[model samples]
Target chain A: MKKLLVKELIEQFQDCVNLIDGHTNTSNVIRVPGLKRVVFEMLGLFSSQIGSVAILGKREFGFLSQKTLVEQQQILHNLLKLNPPAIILTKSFTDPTVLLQVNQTYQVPILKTDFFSTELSFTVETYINEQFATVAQIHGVLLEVFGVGVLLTGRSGIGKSECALDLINKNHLFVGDDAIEIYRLGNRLFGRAQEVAKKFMEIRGLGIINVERFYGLQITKQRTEIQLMVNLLSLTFERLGTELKKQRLLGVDLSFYEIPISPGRKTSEIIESAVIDFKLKHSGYNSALDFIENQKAILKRKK
Target chain B: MKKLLVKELIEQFQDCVNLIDGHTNTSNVIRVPGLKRVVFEMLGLFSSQIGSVAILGKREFGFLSQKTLVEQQQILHNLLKLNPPAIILTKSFTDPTVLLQVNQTYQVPILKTDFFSTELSFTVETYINEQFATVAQIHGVLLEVFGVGVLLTGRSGIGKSECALDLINKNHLFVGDDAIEIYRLGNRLFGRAQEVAKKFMEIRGLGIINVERFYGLQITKQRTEIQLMVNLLSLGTELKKQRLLGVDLSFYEIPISPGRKTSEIIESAVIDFKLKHSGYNSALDFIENQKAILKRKKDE
Candidate 1:
């Protein structure tokens, strides 16, 4: 996941993400906890453990809206046991005086933003989703084919990066030249250019060159949703028929394919066609099914 | 155009984009001449026309600030020769007295907004570009597939609308059902749903359904930059190439044949286009890289 440090956010957003009080607790995490719908009173509400980041946007008063300052202070003290990493208060209107005081005492960073509740929540939710996104660092080349995220995973030095760099020249987004980071959002998966190597292609012998610079900015996406995972193999025991297969990543099951790899085969075009086929299957069009049905009809007539 | 009337702006934006004068002029075209950049003395500075909108955000008091009422009015008189459709005064701190009086005399609108010049300009510029965009109304469905804009154009009853609805179910965006307004922004092109039928899909029998409701706002984009224009024909005369040529907007003359999957083809085409649109066609890139390597090998 890309880093979204509270310190960095404060520096970047400035007034938009102000540090109200406390130790200015600087922390980086994969995800920000949306404590809006989840109330403290609910038994298992806070059990999700979303990196200890607590956000109380508008419409989520909870115990913080308690009448007396002492009551709110008590609630605030109770919140300390959670040891929140970062406290984000969205709502320029409502005053979270107790939260601020609590943060100051607990040394927690209480960040404030001026955007209204819903919009602010949405903005943060998206960024949080992006930052805290579940990622799996895999040694493979990720490419976006026909708007579908295709991860080509096989053997190392199997020309994955070489195949990828070539694909990139065809307006294909290069996720990473070396190690690619795969992020999971629900059942959908996204892959992006990992920090160090990035679009820096290592073609067996050729030195590092900026694949991103050579092409364009859009060539390097922050992230692209991984649709179908292809475990490219020179040879494998698995059959590529009917239902391809399934590969689970970050707990979401994705349709998996095992395409045979060889020198004669245009690796990129095969993958492109597989994505197209994946699309057709998704659109409820199964050419294999049609062929099977036709064969079955012939069998039935013979019977 | 998304009806952002001056009256409605006052009602909606109120303090943000307010109408300081009546008539409201009630009309604004696509371009707002940012007079801040241009000096009044450049002979035909006003004549180089950016619609009929005159904006005074930061500088140039010109003769308008000549300190005398007659000279100020004289400046306004010179401004009249340009025949401004509307006068927009940005920055609340500045006096609107001179501009307002000029509008009052000329019967043009004096619009005031509480926004910084640049920010205000950006917001209005986007809106003006939107409202006054170079658009072509066509029959078909526009969608954002795999986060790339794909416009589907074909014959009537070619199931374009039905195909679009099916595609929407695949976690894709539904721009419009029947009437799609295509706006060309220089080299780039954007397709969106028109005002009355925004995200409103007309599926032959199902009447009008609010696409925004079922799919949420994320799947219902206001506008998407078109990456490819597919002229979907039942059996098109156009040749289908593995590599669709042209850059700005790739035109796929996809010939239709029976037993072909409509949604899949459209979906795959869009995704394929998005990949091409992304940058660096790997198939050819690899071939070229191999050639370069071979040449280097020979050199070595």
Candidate 2:
């Protein structure tokens, strides 16, 4: 469970990160690994955004001209001193002045891109909004059957509410539904559904029906940690490929299964198998791989 | 055929656009359309880059607070009396504030967006880049038969050189091969291949062989604009869809296509149909409306 906070990471790399402390000052600094407290100063400036910071060739900044190297280094020094929350670098550097300086002073993680300064700025802004805006914790159904937390998500018309209702009737304790608040605690990210959606199914044609009203209050709970996310999409011919076999969301690797909504398929049984397969995957077992291995092993035995 | 310059557009809306001139002393200036002079005021100790300017909500400024609304109006008036840009607005005003204000004080075009501070900043950056960047235009070969750009691209062994060579043998004028420089100019983008790659194709099995050397100089041109781009991929898929259809590139709505022998198709189609004429996109609309029309006809 390796987990790191963005704020803490910034502090750790204070020396290497560029700081635009308001509109007044800028600096660039660098940190070296295995070397204790040895900070190097490259450049410093007053009143300007770094615009772009990149690792130059083994020796210097590639984009900066020779005459501006010292001024750029001074600006780099000021930037490193601020330790802003994030650092952006241009594609590749032909000069080593900036790279050598950054390497000597910071422990911060660097994200690099091939876009020009203007394009890179927009990409960084969008990335920050999507990645760090708010920590979203959702509440829905959290099940640990077969060692997998399978989350069910869909639009109102889809059968998520009905499926959860069926799972509860089958003796699976109902977790939160509708809204789920999720939190990342330590290395684990867990979620529990909101209290309102619990025991309530707003199915079209059926109106607002209570799960507790039909399945009894014995199978309902307040909250549970969400471990797996299952997204239900309407079945179509174009989506029949096995491409959905490998799916990842929010950087958390989990077992994902897509169940097409058809009249003949027992949705509950399909869900159960999906959970079981997920459990098997967690224990380092895969049915597809097992089948392939069996075929190879049998041929070897015949020889 | 109508083209617009970035400076002209900014000038046209000068009254609405705030000018923060950063020199020895930072000044806040506003220009109203039809006004001869800009409304200027000295803001103490504010430093900014020469080209750096922010188009943000008035609330972002400490002087434009709700409690200081009256004070804000007074400040705006004093600034306007000295010199005015084409436009000006107050903190409490809405999107059409500049437009309405112009009707009373001066006549100028005003623009507004519902975006917040961060969103406004992003929009401004995008607008500036699009307006100012030099757009490169390239003559590209489009395979109308397959609806693709057929970009012949790859390393020596990738068959790009061979495919391109074969296509040219079929009577297509050779656009530059090898390295191409792309640039953005106003709304148009253009690209042309390097002189070294002109009339030359490098085959994987056969090293760098000159197409002109084998076929003579009459088969090649020094350079040509790349209108459509195609890349030759070595992956074991035939007729693979490469270009994203329905997406506009640099104001030119074109889709990229990639495949084997796609170069030949591209060359043939490029000659048959003009590149600009092939950009008609109506697949989705046609399907949706055609179904509706058929239903109506049946009912009638």
The parts of candidate 2 lying over 4 Å away from their true place are A1-147, A195-198, A236-251, A301-303, B1-300
CAPRI grade of model 1: incorrect
Q: What is the TM-score of chain B in candidate 2?
A: 0.36
Please give me the DockQ of candidate 2 compared with the native complex.
0.00
**Best by the DockQ measure:** 1
Q: Model 2's A-chain: what TM-score?
A: 0.47
Tell me the tens digit of each residue's lDDT in model 1 across A1-303.
235666766675685777766654576443453434335622333544445456665545644564577666665665654666676777743577666666666787777777766675456656555566666777777778667777888877565655665466577776775567777766666788665545655433222344554456787766677777887775445333567678887776777877766643556777777787888888888777888888888898755
Predicted complexes: DockQ each: 0.01, 0.00
Error of 1 at A42 (Å): 14
Best by TM-score: 1
